[PDB]
Chains A and B, each alone.
Chain A
Amino acid sequence: QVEDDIQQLLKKINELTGIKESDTGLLAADK
């Protein structure tokens, strides 16, 4: 269950990493 620990908290901090950008989302010669 140590691998469960490993992969689980890895993906959880990855979910945080997604939440980071999710919350951080907020003519003269041509026209």
Chain B
Amino acid sequence: LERIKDYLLMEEEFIRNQEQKQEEERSKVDDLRGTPMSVGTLEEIIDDNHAIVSTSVGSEHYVSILSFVDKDLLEPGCSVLLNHKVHAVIGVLMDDTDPLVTVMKVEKAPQETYADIGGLDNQIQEIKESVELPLTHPEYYEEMGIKPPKGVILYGPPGTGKTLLAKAVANQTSATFLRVVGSELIQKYLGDGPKLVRELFRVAEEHAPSIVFIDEIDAIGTKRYDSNSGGEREIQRTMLELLNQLDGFDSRGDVKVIMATNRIETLDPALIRPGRIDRKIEFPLPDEKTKKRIFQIHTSRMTLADDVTLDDLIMAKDDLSGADIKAICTEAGLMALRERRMKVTNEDFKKSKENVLYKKQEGTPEGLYL
């Protein structure tokens, strides 16, 4: 019966997403403008009510200003609204940027808090103290004169929940948030490194205290030495642009960065210095104590005959990810669903444990220390 409630909630949220002047003075604004408005570029403003502009085709004109709002808000470097009759300077353009700003801006917290992963709470406690504490409880930093950390690197074996940690911190926040898969810079475009970078961090500064979240750029740490005999492409120049944007000049502000990698030694050690990126966090193949918690989460709301013990599977083999546990908990459920059965016995878990674990295959010892 709850599905009706969830569907009505989603459709009413869409209804709210659809729920998004002057009788004659606004019509005079409609004649203060020519209706095909345009986008230009101020070069100078000789302030005697006519300005010089620049166009996307490059024709630059003494064009008169028609102020309704304060006309001294717009600057050289800020665009204008020019007509097609005399390209008349119309007025208020709130400062717009690329289309690629709303693209990297997640508008939801679609998943849940630290109650989602199972057990790492020493370093989950670290990212806690380095994001959740400086944001929500910023007492002692002012009260002991000590500045909070800025950069956090996630690494280790993959499928530990780096994505899960990412979305978990994407839950518990009131600061604005941005989602950047930072490897997107494969163009054949010279320049165009700094365009995304400068506009991203300008937007980040203009909105709020925020997190600027780069995700999986472990390939792009291109060895910091050359490309071999002839290489130079743009990629070094773009990462150096991001480096200078981070820890050059022009004080950082209330901007946070969390980063995640699978392999870590192939990175660029001109970034991994503290100050530029502060924290580094290991996510290893955990233990046989929080595997119980990962099975506990993955057997929270599934039909399990409690006769079986997952601790038998934990006692079987000891090195696998929590994603492997999720794969087992779904796959044994499918093996139960072979023949319309209620709950899951032991042997579905056995066949599913064997089934998922077809990963490591090498070879031939060791094995033969011995």
Contact = CB atoms under 8 A, between A and B. Distances in A.
Interface of A: 1, 3-4, 7-8, 11-12, 14-15, 18, 21-22, 27, 29-31
A5 to B, nearest CB: 9
- Among A3, A11, A21, find the residue whose CB has the most chain B CB atoms closer than 10 A: A11
B6 to A, nearest CB: 7
B1 A21 contact: no
B8 A15 contact: yes
A4 B5 contact: yes
Shortest Cβ-Cβ A-B pairs, 9 listed:
A31-B28, A8-B5, A11-B9, A30-B68, A4-B2, A11-B5, A7-B5, A15-B12, A27-B25
Interface string B1-17: 11011101100100110
Nearest to A30: B68
30 contacts: A1-B1, A3-B2, A4-B1, A7-B2, A8-B1, A8-B2, A8-B4, A8-B5, A11-B5, A11-B6, A11-B8, A11-B12, A12-B5, A12-B8, A14-B9, A14-B12, A15-B8, A15-B12, A18-B16, A18-B19, A21-B19, A22-B19, A27-B25, A27-B28, A30-B28, A30-B29, A30-B66, A30-B68, A31-B31, A31-B32
Contacts of A3: 2
Nearest to B22: A27
A29 B67 contact: yes
A11 B16 CA distance: 13
Nearest to A22: B19
Nearest to B16: A18
A21 B18 CA distance: 12
A7 B2 CA distance: 8
Contacts of B66: 30
Contacts of B68: 30
- Among B5, B9, B19, B66, find the residue whose CB has the most chain A CB atoms closer than 10 A: B5
A12 B9 CA distance: 8
A8 to B, nearest CB: 4
A18 to B, nearest CB: 6
Interface in B1-58: 1-2, 4-6, 8-9, 12, 15-16, 19, 25, 28-29, 31-32
A26 to B, nearest CB: 14
B56 to A, nearest CB: 28
Contacts of B12: 11, 14-15, 18
B78 to A, nearest CB: 20
A7 B66 CA distance: 53
A2 B5 CA distance: 13
Contacts of A21: 19
Contacts of A15: 8, 12
A27 B68 CA distance: 7
Interface string B148-175: 0000000000000000000000000000
B67 A30 contact: yes
Nearest to A1: B1
Contacts of B32: 30-31
Contacts of B67: 29-30
